[PDB]
Amino acid sequence: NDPLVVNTDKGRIRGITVDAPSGKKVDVWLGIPYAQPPVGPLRFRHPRPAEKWTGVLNTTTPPNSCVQIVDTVFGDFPGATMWNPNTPLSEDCLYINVVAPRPRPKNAAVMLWIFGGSFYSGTATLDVYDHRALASEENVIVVSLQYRVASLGFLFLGTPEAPGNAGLFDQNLALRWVRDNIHRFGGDPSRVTLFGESAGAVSVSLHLLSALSRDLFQRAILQSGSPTAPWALVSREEATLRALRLAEAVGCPHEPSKLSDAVECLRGKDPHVLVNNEWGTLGICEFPFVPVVDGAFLDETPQRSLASGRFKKTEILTGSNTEEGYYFIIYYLTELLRKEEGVTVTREEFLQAVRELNPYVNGAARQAIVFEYTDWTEPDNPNSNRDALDKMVGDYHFTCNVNEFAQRYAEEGNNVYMYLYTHRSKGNPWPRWTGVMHGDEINYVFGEPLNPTLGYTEDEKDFSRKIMRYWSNFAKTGNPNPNTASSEFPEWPKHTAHGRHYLELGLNTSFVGRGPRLRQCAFWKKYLPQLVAATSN
Amino acid sequence: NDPLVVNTDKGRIRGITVDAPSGKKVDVWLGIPYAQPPVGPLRFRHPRPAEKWTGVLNTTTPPNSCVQIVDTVFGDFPGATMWNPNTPLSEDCLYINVVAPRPRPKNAAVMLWIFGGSFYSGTATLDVYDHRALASEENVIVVSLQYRVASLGFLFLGTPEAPGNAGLFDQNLALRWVRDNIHRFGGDPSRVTLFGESAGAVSVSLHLLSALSRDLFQRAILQSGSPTAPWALVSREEATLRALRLAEAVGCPHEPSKLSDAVECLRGKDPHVLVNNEWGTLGICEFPFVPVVDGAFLDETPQRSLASGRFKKTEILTGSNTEEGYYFIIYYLTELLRKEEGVTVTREEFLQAVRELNPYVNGAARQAIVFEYTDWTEPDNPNSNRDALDKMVGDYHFTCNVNEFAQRYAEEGNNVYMYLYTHRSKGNPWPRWTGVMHGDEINYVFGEPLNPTLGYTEDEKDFSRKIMRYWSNFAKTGNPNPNTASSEFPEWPKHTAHGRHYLELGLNTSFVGRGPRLRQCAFWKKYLPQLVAATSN
Ligand SMILES: *[C@@H]1O[C@H](CO)[C@@H](O)[C@H](O)[C@H]1NC(C)=O
Ligand SMILES: *[C@@H]1O[C@H](CO)[C@@H](O)[C@H](O)[C@H]1NC(C)=O
Ligand SMILES: *[C@@H]1O[C@H](CO)[C@@H](O)[C@H](O)[C@H]1NC(C)=O
Ligand SMILES: [Cl-]
Numbered sequence A, B: 001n002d003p004l005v006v007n008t009d010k011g012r013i014r015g016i017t018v019d020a021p022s023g024k025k026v027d028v029w030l031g032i033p034y035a036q037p038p039v040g041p042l043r044f045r046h047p048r049p050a051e052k053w054t055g056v057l058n059t060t061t062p063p064n065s066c067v068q069i070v071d072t073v074f075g076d077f078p079g080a081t082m083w084n085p086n087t088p089l090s091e092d093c094l095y096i097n098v099v100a101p102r103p104r105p106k107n108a109a110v111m112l113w114i115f116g117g118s119f120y121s122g123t124a125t126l127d128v129y130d131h132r133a134l135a136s137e138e139n140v141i142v143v144s145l146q147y148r149v150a151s152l153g154f155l156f157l158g159t160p161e162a163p164g165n166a167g168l169f170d171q172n173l174a175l176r177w178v179r180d181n182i183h184r185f186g187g188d189p190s191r192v193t194l195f196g197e198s199a200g201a202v203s204v205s206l207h208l209l210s211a212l213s214r215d216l217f218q219r220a221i222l223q224s225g226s227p228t229a230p231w232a233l234v235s236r237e238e239a240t241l242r243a244l245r246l247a248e249a250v251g252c253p254h255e256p257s258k259l260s261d262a263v264e265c266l267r268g269k270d271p272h273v274l275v276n277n278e279w280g281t282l283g284i285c286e287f288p289f290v291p292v293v294d295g296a297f298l299d300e301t302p303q304r305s306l307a308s309g310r311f312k313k314t315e316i317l318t319g320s321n322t323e324e325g326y327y328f329i330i331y332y333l334t335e336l337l338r339k340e341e342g343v344t345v346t347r348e349e350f351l352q353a354v355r356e357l358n359p360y361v362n363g364a365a366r367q368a369i370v371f372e373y374t375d376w377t378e379p380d381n382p383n384s385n386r387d388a389l390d391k392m393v394g395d396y397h398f399t400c401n402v403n404e405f406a407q408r409y410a411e412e413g414n415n416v417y418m419y420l421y422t423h424r425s426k427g428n429p430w431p432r433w434t435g436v437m438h439g440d441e442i443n444y445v446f447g448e449p450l451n452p453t454l455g456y457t458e459d460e461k462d463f464s465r466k467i468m469r470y471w472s473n474f475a476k477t478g479n480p481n482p483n484t485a486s487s488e489f490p491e492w493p494k495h496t497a498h499g500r501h502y503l504e505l506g507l508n509t510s511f512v513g514r515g516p517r518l519r520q521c522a523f524w525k526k527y528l529p530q531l532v533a534a535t536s537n
Helices: A132-138 A150-154 A166-185 A199-207 A236-249 A259-268 A271-275 A302-308 A326-332 A347-357 A363-372 A382-411 A441-445 A458-477 A518-534 B132-138 B150-154 B166-185 B199-207 B236-249 B259-268 B271-275 B302-308 B326-332 B347-357 B363-372 B382-411 B458-477 B518-534
Strands: A005-008 A011-014 A016-019 A025-033 A056-058 A095-101 A108-114 A141-145 A156-159 A187-197 A219-223 A316-321 A416-421 A501-505 A512-514 B005-008 B011-014 B016-019 B025-033 B056-058 B095-101 B108-114 B141-145 B156-159 B187-197 B219-223 B316-321 B416-421 B501-505 B512-514
Touching: A005 A166, A025 A132, A025 A166, A095 A132, A095 A166, A108 A166, A108 A199, A108 A458, A132 A141, A132 A458, A141 A166, A150 A166, A150 A236, A150 A271, A156 A236, A156 A259, A166 A187, A166 A199, A187 A199, A187 A441, A187 A458, A199 A219, A219 A441, A219 A458, A236 A259, A302 A382, A316 A382, A316 A458, A326 A382, A347 A363, A347 A382, A363 A518, A363 B518, A382 A416, A382 A518, A441 A458, A518 B363, B005 B166, B025 B132, B095 B132, B095 B166, B108 B166, B108 B199, B108 B458, B132 B141, B132 B458, B141 B166, B150 B166, B150 B271, B156 B236, B156 B259, B166 B187, B166 B199, B187 B199, B187 B458, B199 B219, B219 B458, B236 B259, B302 B382, B316 B382, B316 B458, B326 B382, B347 B363, B347 B382, B363 B518, B382 B416, B382 B518
Parallel strands: A011 A056, A108 A141, A108 A187, A187 A219, A219 A316, A316 A416, A416 A501, B011 B056, B108 B141, B108 B187, B187 B219, B219 B316, B316 B416, B416 B501
Antiparallel strands: A005 A011, A016 A025, A025 A095, A095 A141, A501 A512, B005 B011, B016 B025, B025 B095, B095 B141, B501 B512
């Protein structure tokens, strides 16, 4: 009997034994199909499941990446190219990857990765997401999936041939494949933990809401993303306009009254032409094609689900990084924050940035933001004014939404674990002033420091082992803490509805705090909305 | 020859030798007259100098106190009775006290005290101000003066017979007396340091502005008071109305057109009847009869003098206590902050208090205050909501005005030293939650802990020695620091215009910080004014 041949519910498949960078060995199945290719008449539409096949399908090659724009802003800068697709771009992209430890488990916990990329970019095949270290060091099945992104994943016109959320129905279908099949690979299908970062975290949080995903997994890890983030969803009316603008931009009919003509033309366009024409006039952290409230995957806004307690009763682990804003500002204010060492911002530049980064609020709101984000010890300090820019973008679009979601989960009686990630890698290629940006924790979550061909210190390797152990303890039990309390493994306390404790994740630290950033988050969530209402006659 | 008989420019006077509680001896001259009694036709008017006398005037008895209301809200509670007049009340109250060390110096520095009491109360004769410890431990001439308070000191109608600021002209005349005479008591008239607390500090600061006082002293110490405090001055237009309201309240004519009838009737009323009818409907930290801009003592608002650099160029030492607001709230919101142990404030009680304590601002401003003064770690915590009431009253009426004054003095090149006083006496008679209140430092400045019959600990005795040494180093040299830096005497750095360092004064501490409370002071001084402007249609 060939332990690498597996009889899935649609056919037999053959995997392959390979080495993790550490030397430990894992079994691997790459590019398992879970849907019909979403091509031709099927573009923009929800996935159909895969047709049965005869024989043995060799599932040993990393799959196609879904069509998306490629980032060339900084040339071959490694900090940017690590997020670009590393396999051929194709609409034929609906595949899953399974990576199992050796020897093969019987009922192991299953960690299912959903990649981020602001819903317009990303792929499960990235080297930074390599599954071999995590599976082999922690004894879990690691699963990853492709899902459609950008307008191919999220075009919405409010018609059956453009119903929205195709990329989310892709993820749901993959979740169903995992529950139907993962036991054949040594995983317990009742022990699936979803984890994802940024738009992948938003995606995970939406599976905590949807009635269609409710029974498809056990618990969730949400790295720097939450469904109350203002970029996370778009209204149905605005999505419809954005789709029609895309149709115009590529030469298609775009009349609100004859939506059939517009969809049909869009289905005939080259896919690269579509994703390369999506980017109109949008503010920072506004992405053109994102989830909507459609009626079937979600039938109410996330804020209404949270207010009413309509979400899955389970544990969650979630957290933020210290410099969440810079990554997005570096690409948006390219004259102000050049990607050079020693950048600073003058007071007059900061005041101009506040208007550009908050383009929708009135005069009174901007002053409040200025007051809230000024260092009153030294108002004109050019470092303080640069850091203020990161914090106001990072608080509003990231940190404060994670806090909000973790709060509601905790108020409703669920165990919550909250982190603030503060480690900057010794080999970080970005300018020193960028600090700990969006996504930096991913390398450590997937155990990349254990790769002996890379430059990580021994301290960083221990750190990555600590983090993988927290993450996988949580998947295995719902609690990141070990049984025997360690010197290397600090205690990670629950984030209670009233304590709101969080654990700082870093090299030489076990600091537990509150929040984080409760005051700035109250500014955005409580003070500023009532001031906008008061001054909008 | 009798060294206790001194020939002043108006006559001879006889003093008396007494003991310090310190064990050392001092010479003392109490009740030296410096003006004609301001009685009869002279009521409300500026002082005339004292008429010459033959013989030897026995100056050995603490002088009369100026007429003022007596506080009975808490009966014989020691925390309150220590501020009540301890000598008979009379309009015949314009006297000075001099206390010299033994053996008598030749050209000693002179520390001249101006009592506080919100311009309606106070007296130089209080036991808490007793001069003997400071004079004998620090080898300085200690001087104190009476000045008229309440409507008797500060009635203004804009006519020659109610010209305003009589109490400040009293202080000016006393300052003159000191420069004409203090060398006969062993003091250098070119080395007068003014010091005062609360309305006494305001008074000191107004002598730093007035052209009539400019050459009458060398430097200044300002404890918890500044001329930018919103209670420190009243407009000429409002002063006139308040005076006319007082006339009405006591049955006098009060027609805005016939001011002579009103003044002449007021000159006939009993002085106690006058001061007991002053208290109309006023907010917290609003006192009816206070300085005005008259044309002669001051001819522009303090803020206009500060902005234009028209103020005396000299060193200043100044500071705040940590709970500046509670004292006034305890007397204003007597149902909410009962003088009992274990008081707390509910969230709903706090929101009502914000409206009562900031009764002039609109809805938007109140929300900003609420947001600024909420503990966002635990918004509903009833200790936090009680402390917030102290901080919003103390910041707005005290701490932030001291900061502003020290800031402007530093920007103009003068040496400034800033303290935050944080010591609560072990024997404090107020409830524990009141913290370190307005006026608490006065006992330590005057060396009261060195009286062994009071209950002070040994550490508190040391603290008082340290503080008298800082204060008198400052009077002697312009710098509170000693020459040989000690472990008992930390370094007190200058408060520079951009560093804004302060020294925390307390038992087990040498902490240096910035501000204090730069962010909250920016809220009152920069943010809230621009938000009121924006929302005032
Ligand atoms: C798959 O692998 C086997 C060898 O292990 C090979 O003989 C076969 O041709 C491969 N391709 C397909 C399509 O099965
Ligand atoms: C003043 O004191 C002297 C000596 O102590 C005494 O003889 C004299 O009577 C006193 N004068 C008055 C007016 O009491
Ligand atoms: C003074 O502060 C130090 C700092 O921890 C402390 O160890 C010491 O006990 C303190 N002394 C007191 C509070 O009397
Ligand atoms: Cl001047």
